[PDB]
Design an enzyme around this catalytic site. Structure first.
Site, short mmCIF file in Angstrom:
data_model
loop_
_atom_site.label_atom_id
_atom_site.label_comp_id
_atom_site.label_asym_id
_atom_site.label_seq_id
_atom_site.Cartn_x
_atom_site.Cartn_y
_atom_site.Cartn_z
N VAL A 45 0.84 -1.19 0.00
CA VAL A 45 0.00 0.00 0.00
C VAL A 45 0.88 1.24 0.00
O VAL A 45 1.79 1.38 0.83
CB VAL A 45 -0.95 0.00 1.21
CG1 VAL A 45 -1.74 1.30 1.26
CG2 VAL A 45 -1.89 -1.20 1.14
N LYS A 46 0.61 2.16 -0.93
CA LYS A 46 1.33 3.42 -1.01
C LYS A 46 0.59 4.48 -0.21
O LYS A 46 -0.62 4.66 -0.37
CB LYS A 46 1.48 3.85 -2.47
CG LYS A 46 2.20 2.84 -3.34
CD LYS A 46 2.17 3.24 -4.81
CE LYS A 46 2.86 4.57 -5.05
NZ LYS A 46 2.83 4.95 -6.49
#
Lengths: 222, 222, 222, 224, 221, 222, 222, 224, 221
Positions: free
Chosen positions: A86-87
């Site tokens: 997840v960014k």
């Protein structure tokens, strides 16, 4: 382990074409690139894993500005596909989500990094990767490579569990400089990936090799 | 392991003459070099192995532009002699062949390298060696040694199974600089190998040594 | 082990004088220095061994121009004393003898080295040491220390069983620079060895110490 | 670890040793014929006093005087017997190198003093000396490369005579001392007048005054 | 993860910063504590609570004589657990550092303006030394160079002691110290509040959600 | 003005031989060099002027330790030939003589310079040249070229009427380095001057030139 | 003035071809290249002058080994064409001829320069140019560019009427480096001159320009 | 002085030229066959429009297409007659160097375009070209030494062909442009999309907002 | 001698600093002026009087549109003689700089964070450009490098424009700017008050007079 060159796109066909002749490690996305394809994340992400051909890492970014809402979106994205990181944008609310997600099975990436300060804080907060926007830093302050070099040196000394993930590139020299100053890997746009290998010198060398071969053997057989 | 100085020729007589007084590690060929001798590969490769005197590595290059044909030509070249590494140009079709030959016993070399970009991509694709054309790069962009030094550092960091194999030389200092910036081995043309030890100062020093030995002993006996 | 400072001479009396106060590792010879003493090698070598006071390495050089004769001369020299290394000029014929003498009990040194090319070729051929003529290189091209530095790196990277043996010196800084850039050991002429510790500042300081000690205690006793 | 044996005091004055060792981390005391002659007390008497003034079993350093090597050896044995943990200082010349050669393997450890170039220090290290002491400020006076000489010497010993370390000597300011410790010196010996002024920094006194001036203004007194 | 410390006595500022920043602990000095004018034996337990974990806390003595520095160090050390006592590196401070070495009271040598006092404090038994980077830049203009030399000197000759960067006015001084050998840094609260606010990041985030609304409708994912 | 290369000898035959093929600017002498020929100064100086062939500068050195005697010896040396510069050692008494001879037509050179301190003081005292002993400085402190470079810069800034005169050389590169770091001129020993142009590579290139000329024209005519 | 790129050849047809599109300043020759054409100098020199198209400088080299004969050959060469400079090898006899030819109307060039010592001595002797063999120096000692750089500085400081004329090249970067470190001009072999502008990237860009122009305007007209 | 002729815009779009020249110090307009083909307007029509859109008599740049040198010369004369103050761009190859040679001394000034190394730029300058234009970003793509090529080329021209200056081209960010102007470029030409984003700096907008937020809080309005 | 400017609107601070420091002039910005909250048309004549000479004065516009920036620049320029109007280097600021170029109103390009906006302002007609050194150090950490590149770019391509260093937090930033190509600098008042107080100088002076009293009796000479 060969996981070095990532492709920054949301188009499935571009992944299948580029992975057929390039050592592609995985696919990264951002809200702008995903909005261009206009396809929902819970559908395009399984299509990008299939297009990749191997168990490479996929990257997707949250969109909400609230930390408690980033954590909810991070859990949903992690369940859309396998081997997804997840960014999270490195701001005040972003570090809260990185802090809370530390220790869990949801690996995070600190994106939208413009200086070594936010990259170091994200690494200390528990992020596995931090992603400086190399070309955007060159536009704003003209020290993109120097920022990547400083950040990678700071992480190796004070937060070695976090590596630098180069992003935002316009030419091959930017990509190679980042890998040479301490980046663990890089992600390149599709237009740069298609223009990586076209070298007119290589084509001129091959045509001369085949011309000499025909003059001495009368064919192209071997 | 003492496998450092390779010779770039298809002339059997030149291989026998040089290996008698030089520590030659093996023989490299390209379509232009092989066409100069104009003897078929399935015949000249066993002759070069015999002329070498030991089981050093041999290098042959594919000819076709199609990836599927390069793989067929690579398997045929591998069967002509033992300890042969197939040289493949680092282009779009060549990177397919390197990707398909990875894992097999057909070790590959990425040749026709003009920048560190194609060399790094070839190493990540599964190539055991990458060969930049130092003198040709000096012609086109004037950064032959810098390209070699960058490519060697990039491989040592991100693709350690691949090494830089210096090629295309016109003087001794180019050879020594490549070995000094991280090259694993070098291959030199035959005309250069015959001129390496040619140093008039050494001949004058040896002549002065035995001349002073005659004046004191009246002979060249010890 | 303390085997760093060798002396280049054939005078037996000079060895006994210098070894009396200097940590001399051994004695090196060459045809020109051996011709000045006008003494046969089978006699002076046992004399230099007894003059040295320990089983340090001795060095003697061949004089013939052909490899088949260099090998015979190297065998007779090896049988004159114990712990002797044969010096061989690094040319086309010298590399043949080093090649043939590799694997035998006769250790070889590559002398008459004027550039890193012949130093590296001698090390890859099986030579235990290579001897660049530092001052003679400074005379012809003016890069003696740079040549030694480059050669020491090339050997450490590609032929680590061969070391650099600094030779041909005219002042103390040439010697110290060679030991600082990668020389395993050095050999100096006898005239330099007798002038090494010559420092009027040291003698002036010792005289000042004795002057103050006589002014206080009225004597040189303690 | 480190051991802490880093700062040595170059004096023969017993009172100065007591004063400085009370608040400074002093490792030992070094002497030379000029310094010992100022006190005018014989070495068999001053060396036991310096060991007592030091307060611990740190290394003491004393130097021979004679020019003859055989007399240096005799003087080195008498100095080694005056106190415990004493290292004999010997000038690095031809006769001094004979004494260092003869004293190797024995229980008398030696230091090579009066070093003005890296050639002396390297030869002394190969001869058997445990330490070599270049005169930094005197080299700066004569050739202006004191720190460069120390850096080269320390590098030559690390590569070719690892049993010998560099012992910085002859200093006039704190910058010379810190440079030597940074370029490869194992330890340094400083004069007494330098050791008394090492910590003199008016900026520190001003910061301390400001800290307590702010403390009095807010709490009324200096209580905590 | 014990890298970023906050130089403040404001319990509220610690509670806010610790909610989103990886804070390792809290440092104080006489001026910072006197500004709030809260007594040390009360604010230190408050700082321990506000920190949320058992990180290190730092408090500084104020007297001039070594004997009273020891008395103040013993009282400070008893106010909270895991407290390191800051001592100015002068002649009297070196006596107090020596007297406390070997006891459960660990010390930090503060008010360091050159590498000489930093090295002597390390050899005397201090666990940390804290040069005033910005104050050295004011007086001699070599703050980072002093930190770099001091860090190398300690690594070679007093490895039990490490450099603790202090006195900062911008992010670049802080990052330079962490690059030239500092183990950790302490930054004022105003600097800590200005570390993350980057206008380029905010513009990049708003551009992301602006493109997301145009392609889908709202911030749904 | 082409007055750069001086020769350091008192041998008339060596002056005639070298000046016939080398651009010799003048002749320098010191008490040791002059004693080697052992011919009185009032006789050998006119001979060296004749052997030089032009009115180049000549250099003679005083002998006494007393300042008043050096001034008397300097005036006598100045009267033996024309265009003679008196060499004076840069010590306490020598600096008196340089101070007293300033303003007179007796131009002085500060010799026996071992550090930039005495060289600068000599230039400020009124000396036209200062001569550091490069090879002797390399012996004592190993910073011969650095001393020359510092002294040249100091004079150019604070005493521009004085220039650095390189002396005491053992190889060609020491000479070229001095002229490269700010020396006005150099004086070399005769043995070095006879070995300067000695380059075996040049002889081999000239031999190969005329050898190829015979194969095409059957003669050495043009 | 634009007199920078000279060509080293005796082929009259090659000069006419290269001067048709390159800013050729003149033609240089040497005995080996002149022997290949097998044409007498009194005939080929007027041909090269007409082939050049302007009054650019021509260069011819002597062949004798004695100075008295080099002078005679230099006078006859000077009378074959206008604006000719005589090339003389920088040895003991060559410096005598340069010394004697100084002040006359015959300008000289010092060739066969392998180190800065002979380059400086030739310039001080009266030579207008000196020609280091860059690639041959790289072969023997590996410091061709460093030698040219040092020589250019020494001449600028001590013999400014003499310039450095770069010679003996194998690639474009050697030529450009020489012009960047102080070469007044360079001469390149004809094979290098025909390969200078060879850049497949330039041809690929021009083909792309014409492809886009035909897609829009349906023609190559403008 | 300087002259101010430093920033050029690389486009054939008339509307973009008008917009950018209204607030940016634009020196002129450069074109190439790919850029001009996008507008699909013939050169004899677009060149007068670009001169009018520029608003001043700045330099315009147009490129030939043919491979033959004699045809390049004919195309260069027709382009020079379409507008005033036009410099003809010619690729630096063998046939292009013939045209540059023939056009020297005439009233048609030339630029050497499609420069990928310093060898092309030096030969073009010696041939008579007033400017040479290396493709910085394309060189970075092929050999990764775009700035180094510009610095070497500018140094070679300053020493050997002073009548020819370097004209930076092919840029993707502000850092490339500033590096070229700092290593020896006389001027640069930038794409339109780059020129529109040159001044985009959110830090400046934040500082301006803070300035007026402090002004409203103290004075009530934004009056001065 | 027109090198050191003071960044303040405090007339009293100007009168004190000018009594012993070589002050070249006074610079203001909206935040500094709003803190004192004194109207510009009154404080600017006060600053001219307090300065003591006819040095340059600097005042900044506040509106966002170029048309109103011009109106504010004309009013500011009329409040005192020898006033240069500061204009932020954005798109609207570049329009106002262009419109004012050629008139008697000289401009300074302020709020400069990179060398790109500095060069464009110089080419547009600004007489000065003022990068925020400490604010650049905060955001990208290359404040001095930006000043150095900008100074060289102007010397080569826009020589009528020069770099004016601003936004400082220690003496070392100020001296670095003056060394890498700045024509002059403006420093905040708090920094100007802390420039001269050097404890080593005070200790050296008191040691001089202490030795003088011991040898003669008092401070007589």
């Amino acid at each position: 382990g060969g996981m070095k060159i990532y492709i920054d796109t949301a188009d499935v066909n571009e992944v299948k074409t580029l992975v057929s002749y390039l050592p592609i490690a995985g696919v990264t996305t951002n809200p702008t690139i995903a909005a261009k394809s206009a396809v929902k994340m819970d559908v395009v992400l399984p299509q990008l894993r299939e297009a990749l051909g191997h168990d490479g890492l996929l990257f997707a970014q949250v969109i909400s500005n609230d930390a408690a809402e980033m954590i909810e979106e991070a859990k949903r994205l992690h369940g859309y596909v396998d081997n997804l990181i997840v960014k999270i944008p490195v701001n005040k609310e972003g570090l809260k989500a990185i802090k809370a997600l530390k220790g869990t099975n949801i690996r995070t990436l600190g994106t939208a990094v413009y200086n070594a300060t936010q990259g170091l804080l994200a690494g200390l907060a528990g992020a596995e990767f931090v992603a400086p926007y190399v070309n955007r830093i060159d536009m704003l302050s003209g020290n993109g490579i120097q920022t990547v070099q400083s950040l990678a040196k700071l992480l190796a000394l004070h937060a070695p569990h976090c590596k630098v993930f180069g992003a935002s590139f316009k030419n091959n020299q930017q990509v190679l400089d980042c890998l040479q100053v301490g980046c663990e890997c890089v992600t390149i746009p599709a237009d740069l990936a298609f223009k990586m290998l076209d070298n007119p010198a290589v084509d001129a060398a091959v045509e001369q090799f085949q011309s000499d071969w025909k003059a001495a053997y009368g064919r192209l057989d071997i």
